[PDB]
Amino acid sequence: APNQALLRILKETEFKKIKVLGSGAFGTVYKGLWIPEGEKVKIPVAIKELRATSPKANKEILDEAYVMASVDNPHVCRLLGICLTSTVQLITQLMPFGCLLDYVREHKDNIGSQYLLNWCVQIAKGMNYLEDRRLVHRDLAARNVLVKTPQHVKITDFGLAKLLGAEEKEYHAEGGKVPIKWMALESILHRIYTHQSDVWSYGVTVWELMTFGSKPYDGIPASEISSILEKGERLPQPPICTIDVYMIMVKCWMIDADSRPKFRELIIEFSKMARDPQRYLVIQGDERMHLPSPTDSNFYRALMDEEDMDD
Ligand SMILES: CCC(=O)Nc1cc(Nc2nccc(-c3cn(C)c4ccccc34)n2)c(OC)cc1N(C)CCN(C)C
């Protein structure tokens, strides 16, 4: 299975940085516009620039560019290209509403059952596509899901994503700092990562959204978590979730990895629930909340722009 994905190299004069969005260990990510020459289009883009220019930091962002260029799905983040300047720049589709964790935290009074179940469906679809590509995410969380519109979310952060060939089932890592509260038990004990460990992290992500962004195992540090899950203890039932949804989470948290649901079945179940949302999620004032949408907005002369329609 040859990977005939196309790596597009961008000129720095083809995109303009508008503002800074966030800086930290990764570098600094900018909100900007990509204007391919002569095409009369603009594309809202996120530009991650990574300064020191350490060789390992380069190697890692180019690995991320590889993985992001090898995926094409409506619920997986779009890689547009990279710029090979003094500091390597990573250009992706701009997600104007940010990460889903911050979104559910700062909009919890306006989020209904329909949006929650639809987010679960879309995330399950993106993960099922990643499983189709035999790709293991290893870092699925509400922080690693970005919001294009309140009606459309996409999986992101492929820094730990690992591809497998046709016959291979597991991934073994070593000495890498890991999000322990989202990991399956077999990944904590033996550093084994499969698509079913991604299902476990999917269950933790669903629990995150149903609790409107509460941190799992809030008071407990990492050390106890392993044995705590060996005792049979799991995350509690969120107050808004019927037993139908909490059962899905619990099945995602089974010790036997083959007993957990598959992402296609999660798509099916959350689809059934999404057609009658308030039968499965009880939210006070659910019945008329409004979440925003684009109003042809932002700062200047945006008469010729789009993003998921540039092919
Ligand atoms: C992480 C917090 C966040 O999401 N910031 C954010 C991001 C985007 N857009 C976007 N698109 C693609 C990638 C990224 C991105 C990828 N990485 C790895 C990042 C790291 C830091 C910051 C952004 C990114 N960000 C946005 O749209 C204009 C607005 C915001 N805010 C101002 C927040 C709003 N505040 C109320 C919550």
User: Is 303 within the bounds of a domain?
Assistant: no
Cβ density class 106-137: b for 16+ within 10 Å, e for less: ebeeebbbbbbbbbbbbbbbbbbbbbebebbb
Closest CA to 93 of 67, 119, 68: 68
Q: Is 311 a catalytic residue?
A: no
Closest residue by Cα to atom 20, ligand 1, is 22
Same domain assignment for residues 284 and 158:
yes
73 Cα to the center of ligand 1, angstroms: 20
- Residue 260: CATH number of its domain: 1.10.510.10
Q: Measured between alpha carbons, how far is 22 from 310 in angstroms, rounded to an integer?
A: 26
265 Cα to the center of ligand 1, angstroms: 31
37 Cα to the center of ligand 1, angstroms: 27
Same domain assignment for residues 157 and 207:
yes
User: Is 6 within the bounds of a domain?
Assistant: no
- Residue 21: CATH number of its domain: 3.30.200.20
Query: What SS3 class is residue 2?
Result: coil
Question: Looking at 38, 63, 93, which one is the last position of a domain?
Answer: 93
Q: Measured between alpha carbons, how far is 274 from 245 in angstroms, rounded to an integer?
A: 11
Same domain assignment for residues 179 and 275:
yes
User: Is 104 within the bounds of a domain?
Assistant: yes
Same domain assignment for residues 234 and 249:
yes
Q: How far is CA 123 from CA 112, 147, 207, 230, 310, in A?
A: 17, 11, 13, 27, 23
User: Is 199 within the bounds of a domain?
Assistant: yes
User: Is 251 within the bounds of a domain?
Assistant: yes
User: Is 32 within the bounds of a domain?
Assistant: yes
Closest residue by Cα to atom 27, ligand 1, is 96
Residue 82 near residue 48, CB atoms below 8 Å: no
Give the phi and the psi of residue 135 in degrees, each rounded to 5: -115, 130
Long-range contacts of 271-274 (CB under 8 A, 24+ apart): 271/121, 273/117, 273/244, 273/245, 274/114, 274/117, 274/118, 274/120, 274/121
CB-based pocket (< 6 A), ligand 1: 21-22, 29, 31, 46, 92, 94-96, 98-99, 102, 106, 146
Q: In sequence order, which ranges of the chain are alpha helices (DSSP H)?
A: 55-69, 100-106, 113-132, 185-190, 195-210, 222-230, 243-252, 263-274
Closest residue by Cα to atom 10, ligand 1, is 95
From the list 139, 258, 286, 308, the catalytic residue is 139
Q: In sequence order, which ranges of 220-262 are alpha helices (DSSP H)?
A: 222-230, 243-252
Same domain assignment for residues 202 and 235:
yes
The atom number, within ligand 1, closest to the CA of 21 reads 22
Give the phi and the psi of residue 276 in degrees, each rounded to 5: -135, 75
50 Cα to the center of ligand 1, angstroms: 16
Resolution in A: 2.6
Same domain assignment for residues 152 and 234:
yes
Question: Looking at 45, 73, 93, which one is the last position of a domain?
Answer: 93
144 Cα to the center of ligand 1, angstroms: 11
CB-based contacts of 10, cutoff 8 Å, min separation 6? 34, 80, 81, 82, 83, 89, 91
Same domain assignment for residues 21 and 142:
no
Provide the CA 41 distance to its chain's centre, in angstroms.
Answer: 27
Q: Report the number of distinct structural domains present in the chain.
A: 2
The atom number, within ligand 1, closest to the CA of 95 reads 11
Closest CA to 89 of 3, 8, 5: 8
CB-based contacts of 305, cutoff 8 Å, min separation 6? 33, 41, 42, 43, 44
Domain limits for position 44:
12-93
**Is 23 annotated among the ligand-binding residues?**
yes
Question: Looking at 93, 127, 157, which one is the last position of a domain?
Answer: 93
DSSP 8-state secondary structure symbol assigned to residue 96: T
Residue 267 backbone zone (phi > 0: left; psi -120 to 50: alpha; other: beta): alpha
The atom number, within ligand 1, closest to the CA of 103 reads 37
Instruction: At 114, list the tokens.
Output: 């329909």
**Is 92 annotated among the ligand-binding residues?**
yes
Q: Measured between alpha carbons, how far is 260 from 203 in angstroms, rounded to an integer?
A: 10
Compute the radius of gyration of the chain from its Cα atoms: 20
Same domain assignment for residues 210 and 235:
yes
Q: Measured between alpha carbons, how far is 265 from 263 in angstroms, rounded to an integer?
A: 5
The atom number, within ligand 1, closest to the CA of 31 reads 28
Method of determination is: X-ray
Same domain assignment for residues 235 and 157:
yes
Same domain assignment for residues 23 and 127:
no
Same domain assignment for residues 185 and 139:
yes
DSSP 8-state secondary structure symbol assigned to residue 44: E
